[PDB]
Amino acid sequence: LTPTMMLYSGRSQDGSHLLKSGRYLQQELPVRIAHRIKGFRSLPFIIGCNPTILHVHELYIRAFQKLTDFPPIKDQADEAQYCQLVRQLLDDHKDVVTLLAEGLRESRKHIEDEKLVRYFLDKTLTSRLGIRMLATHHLALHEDKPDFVGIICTRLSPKKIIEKWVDFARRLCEHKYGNAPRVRINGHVAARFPFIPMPLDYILPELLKNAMRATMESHLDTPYNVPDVVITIANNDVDLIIRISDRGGGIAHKDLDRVMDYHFTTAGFGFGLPTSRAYAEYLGGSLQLQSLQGIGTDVYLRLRHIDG
């Protein structure tokens, strides 16, 4: 399970579990979308009037309308059709974070209470992550991947998922700087446990891009020889901790209180940190930074284990 939300791990011969899942989505999602719509309605007028914000607002209204218009799920035939609608919405909404970032960038300056946008984005993006997890889980329940029940991996290796995103971030970095730091992984490298990869897929690349940009930008004289990023995995009975340590010079004192703000960037829109922290906390975890100004940064991602 996740916040106020359960991921059904049930399997059934008749496929009755797909019906149960679909029915669950149909009770759960419209309410959650409705809350987000209320969120748009309460946005400060000048932000709510932004055409890009209006577009997302309308997308959410349209999502609510489609889900509520969909008939009661009675049989596998209905459920199959329902999955089509779910796939459509997941796709129609795939650029929502980008749209919000864009619509909010200028318009948020025109209000006074800056805490407002932070609260709206935290609440909206985390609710969205939840919606997407539930929807994607339902679709995945049709899949027959070994080691998966829906989007729940029954034997996730943190080392493997880290390596996947390391390769991804190194590719981006190499394309931009001609090189990329190597990454060493230590600690509980052999750990394997039930876990939902999705949040890691969101968070890991954000933290890795940060460490790599910082490293390259602080070693412009020696792009061909930069210090490794070092990642430590700690697996215990309560949580999983992933520490990502760079020698990229640190987060400057004058920036430290701003890096967690949406839209703050020293370079994207500056969303990597605030989004990652919101997601971690939403899931019962945390994201903490330790800056060694002049040397580098240690970033600690903590995520709670799945309860059985």
Ligand X SMILES: O=C(O)c1sc2cc(Cl)ccc2c1Cl
Cβ burial of 134 (10 Å; 0-12, 13-18, 19+) is: buried
Among positions 272, 274, 285, 296, the unique one binding Mg ion when judged by CB under 5 A? 272
Instruction: Establish whether 264 is an annotated binding residue.
Output: yes
**265 is a contact residue toward ligand ANP (CB under 6 A):** yes
* Separation between Cα atoms, residue 91 and residue 95, nearest integer Å: 8
Instruction: Establish whether 270 is an annotated binding residue.
Output: yes
CA 43 to chain centroid, in Å, comes to 23
* Separation between Cα atoms, residue 237 and residue 284, nearest integer Å: 15
Among positions 75, 91, 112, 221, the unique one binding a copy of itself when judged by CB under 8 A? 112
For ligand X, what does the binding mask look like between residues 47 and 86, x meaning CB under 6 A? Answer: -------------x--x----------------------x
CA–CA–CA angle 266, 270, 271 (5° rounding): 155
Supply the minimum distance, in Å, between the C-beta of residue 4 and a copy of itself: 17
**135 is a contact residue toward ligand X (CB under 6 A):** yes
* Separation between Cα atoms, residue 97 and residue 121, nearest integer Å: 9
Q: Which of residues 95-124 bind ligand ANP (CB under 6 A)?
A: none
Among positions 251, 287, 301, 303, the unique one binding ligand ANP when judged by CB under 6 A? 251
Q: By rule CB under 5 A, what count of residues binds Mg ion?
A: 2
* Separation between Cα atoms, residue 136 and residue 63, nearest integer Å: 16
Q: Which stretch binds a copy of itself (CB under 8 A): 94-102, 104-112, 136-144, 239-247?
A: 104-112
Q: Are 169 and 180 in contact (CB under 8 A)?
A: yes
List of residues 6+ apart from 281 with CB closer than 8 A: 126, 287
Among positions 15, 30, 48, 284, the unique one binding a copy of itself when judged by CB under 8 A? 48
Instruction: Establish whether 266 is an annotated binding residue.
Output: yes
Closest of 201, 212, 164, 168 to residue 279, by C-alpha: 201
Supply the minimum distance, in Å, between the C-beta of residue 286 and ligand ANP: 16
Among positions 19, 29, 100, 242, the unique one binding ligand X when judged by CB under 6 A? 29
Which is nearer to a copy of itself, 53 or 251 (by Cβ)? 53
List of residues 6+ apart from 187 with CB closer than 8 A: 232, 233, 234, 235
> Do β-strands 148-149 and 183-187 pair in parallel, antiparallel, or remain unpaired?
unpaired
Q: Which stretch binds ligand ANP (CB under 6 A): 78-86, 133-141, 206-214, 277-285?
A: 206-214
Q: Which stretch binds ligand X (CB under 6 A): 129-137, 141-149, 246-254, 263-271?
A: 129-137
Burial code (b: 16+ CB inside 10 Å, e: under 16) for 94-116 equals: eebbeebbbbbeebbeeeeeeee
Judged by phi (left if over 0) then psi (alpha if -120 to 50, else beta), residue 299 lies in beta
Supply the minimum distance, in Å, between the C-beta of residue 235 and ligand ANP: 23
Among positions 4, 38, 220, 307, the unique one binding a copy of itself when judged by CB under 8 A? 38
Instruction: Establish whether 261 is an annotated binding residue.
Output: yes
Give the residue before each break in the chain, using a C-to-N cut-off of over 2.5 angstroms; say none if it is continuous. 267
Which residue type does 217 have? E
**140 is a contact residue toward ligand X (CB under 6 A):** no
Q: Which stretch binds ligand X (CB under 6 A): 89-97, 144-152, 158-166, 174-182?
A: 89-97
Q: Which residues bind ligand ANP (CB under 6 A)?
A: 206, 210-211, 214, 246, 248, 251, 255, 259, 264-273, 297
**Per the annotation, where are the binding residues?**
210, 246, 259, 261, 264-266, 270, 273
